[PDB]
Design a protein around this ligand. Structure first.
Ligand code: X8G
Length: 258
């Protein structure tokens, strides 16, 4: 009910617009994504997925608002995109970055179990509730998998976060979200640095099929860099699943705690 939502004149970010608002339920603070007949359907589908998901480390949507424009309203994470933050806060300890990406992998594991493929997992589409609390956002590309198939198949087509099988065969699985998570891990320990800096997506694809990968980010626990590389296994069937990844993040996290 639109009149029970208030918005800022200014925009958190852009590319339409994203805006902070307050939704009278005690008011709760909220984020709204502000938006051709196709785009409604997308925002509306984007919203259908979120509704079905229930997890600490996934952004909770409130609902959709039909008003002046088409608008999407979610439980708001004040601290914003993980990448931008990390860039502007170099003082954050690797122990905390582990904490955060274990949270994303816990969030992704739930998503796997719910047989949904994200398709846009990246450091920009992780948001911080707090500096110790991460949530995955941006389900605009997400698909619920069929009950009898482990992958979504697309038509003609973000390249630098996508596994080879996505680039060559258009197949998006939980395992391809693992590839992206790998790039998201790289981004995290490179304090918000962009991946494969300066290259064209085509060169990136040529590089990967040569067997080459990105180097270790300064300060990065070797065990985490090893995980990045298990995540970047070329063969979809040898690349670990999100259960296997989460397990390794958890086990490793505790040994660093004390
Ligand atoms: C679908 C969606 N949800 N959502 C959101 C949800 C909860 N809190 C917040 N807080 C928040 C969200 C976005 C922000 C900032 C803070 C800042 Cl600062 N800049 N930007 C773009 N934002 C943000 C988006 C669109 N963005 C493109 C990607 O970076 C996320």
């Amino acid at each position: 009910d639109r009149k029970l939502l208030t918005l800022e004149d200014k925009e958190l970010g852009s590319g339409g617009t994203v805006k902070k608002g307050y939704y009278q339920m005690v008011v709760k603070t909220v984020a709204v994504k502000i938006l051709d007949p196709a785009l409604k359907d997308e925002l509306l589908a984007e919203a259908n997925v979120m509704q079905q998901l229930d997890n600490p480390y996934i952004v909770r949507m409130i609902g959709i608002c039909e008003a002046e424009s088409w608008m999407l309203v979610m439980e708001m994470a004040e601290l914003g995109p993980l990448n931008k933050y990390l860039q502007q806060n170099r003082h954050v300890k690797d122990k905390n970055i582990i904490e955060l990406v274990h949270q994303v992998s816990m969030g992704m594991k739930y998503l796997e179990e719910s047989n949904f493929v994200h398709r846009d997992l990246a450091a920009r589409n992780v948001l911080l509730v707090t500096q110790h609390y991460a949530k995955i956002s941006d389900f605009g590309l997400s698909k619920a998998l069929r009950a009898d198939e482990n992958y979504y198949k697309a038509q003609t087509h973000p390249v630098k976060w996508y596994a080879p099988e996505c680039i060559n065969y258009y197949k998006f699985s939980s395992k391809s979200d693992v590839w992206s998570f790998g790039v998201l891990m790289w981004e995290a320990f490179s304090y918000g640095q962009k991946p494969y800096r300066g290259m064209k997506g085509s060169e990136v694809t040529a590089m990967l099929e040569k067997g080459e990968r990105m180097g270790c980010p300064a300060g990065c626990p070797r065990e985490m860099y090893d995980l990045m590389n298990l995540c970047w296994t070329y063969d979809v069937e040898n690349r670990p699943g999100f259960a296997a990844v989460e397990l390794r993040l958890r086990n490793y996290y505790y040994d660093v705690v004390n």
